[PDB]
């Protein structure tokens, strides 16, 4: 089926002065056909709108080999700030556009295919385990790893 969409990490740090933050959006080997996937900026504690960041929402087209893509969110810079800002970017709904999934008005098939081919023709993608990345606007970053 059309692949699971998820981000690389659950937690990231930027600073305003980065200009624009990016998350890489991955797609599993379910990458059969083209799927379009929206995203949008979601503050946790922030002012939002155009005020600690610009609300950055759009759609990303993911084709077969294209199973790596990115989301850009411009950060606004005001400096000398006494407060940590926090936001994340969540995905909307992945939708298959290479196919045209529609109602089964007629698909005369064999018995096995009556469900099996029908389900395969719906091909519906879904979100994954980490379809969001939490960003903290703060000095520098912290990172760790374990296991080979």
From Swiss-Prot:
Ca(2+) 6 binds at residue 52. Interacts with AKAP1. Induction: Down-regulated by hypoxia combined with glucose deprivation (at protein level). Detected in gray and white matter in the spinal cord. Detected in hippocampus neurons. Detected in brain cortex neurons. Detected in skeletal muscle (at protein level). Isoform 1 and isoform 2 are highly expressed in brain; levels are higher for isoform 2. Isoform 1 and isoform 2 are detected in soleus muscle; levels are higher for isoform 1. Detected in gastrocnemius muscle. Disruption phenotype: Mice appear grossly normal, are viable and fertile, but display muscle fiber necrosis; this affects less than 10% of all fibers. Muscle fibers from flexor digitorum brevis show lack of calcium exchange activity, and very slow return of cytoplasmic Ca(2+) to baseline levels after stimulation with caffeine, a stimulus that triggers release of Ca(2+) stores from the sarcoplasmic reticulum. Mutant mice display decreased endurance and perform poorly on the rota-rod test or when hanging from a taut wire, indicating poor coordination and increased fatigue. It comes from Mus musculus (Mouse). Residues 1-70 form the Calx-beta domain. Coiled coil: none annotated. The cytoplasmic Calx-beta domains bind the regulatory Ca(2+). The first Calx-beta domain can bind up to four Ca(2+) ions. The second domain can bind another two Ca(2+) ions that are essential for calcium-regulated ion exchange. It is found in: Cell membrane; Perikaryon; Cell projection, Dendrite; Cell projection, Dendritic spine. It comes from the Eukaryota. Belongs to the Ca(2+):cation antiporter (CaCA) (TC 2.A.19) family. SLC8 subfamily. This is Sodium/calcium exchanger 3. Ca(2+) 5 binds at residues 16, 139. Mediates the electrogenic exchange of Ca(2+) against Na(+) ions across the cell membrane, and thereby contributes to the regulation of cytoplasmic Ca(2+) levels and Ca(2+)-dependent cellular processes. Contributes to cellular Ca(2+) homeostasis in excitable cells, both in muscle and in brain. In a first phase, voltage-gated channels mediate the rapid increase of cytoplasmic Ca(2+) levels due to release of Ca(2+) stores from the endoplasmic reticulum. SLC8A3 mediates the export of Ca(2+) from the cell during the next phase, so that cytoplasmic Ca(2+) levels rapidly return to baseline.
């Amino acid at each position: 089926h059309a692949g699971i969409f998820t981000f690389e990490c659950d937690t990231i740090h930027v600073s305003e002065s980065i200009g624009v933050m990016e998350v890489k959006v991955l797609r599993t080997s379910g990458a059969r056909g083209t799927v379009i996937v929206p995203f949008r900026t979601v503050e946790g504690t922030a002012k939002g709108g155009g005020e600690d960041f610009e609300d950055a929402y759009g759609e990303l087209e993911f084709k077969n080999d294209e199973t790596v893509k990115t989301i850009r969110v411009k950060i606004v810079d005001e400096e000398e700030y006494e407060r940590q800002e926090n936001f994340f970017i969540a995905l909307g709904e992945p939708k298959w556009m290479e196919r045209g999934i529609s109602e089964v008005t007629d698909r005369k098939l064999t018995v096995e295919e009556e469900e099996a081919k029908r389900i395969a023709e719906m091909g519906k993608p879904v979100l994954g385990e980490h379809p969001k990345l939490e960003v903290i606007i703060e000095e520098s970053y912290e990172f760790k790893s374990t296991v080979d």
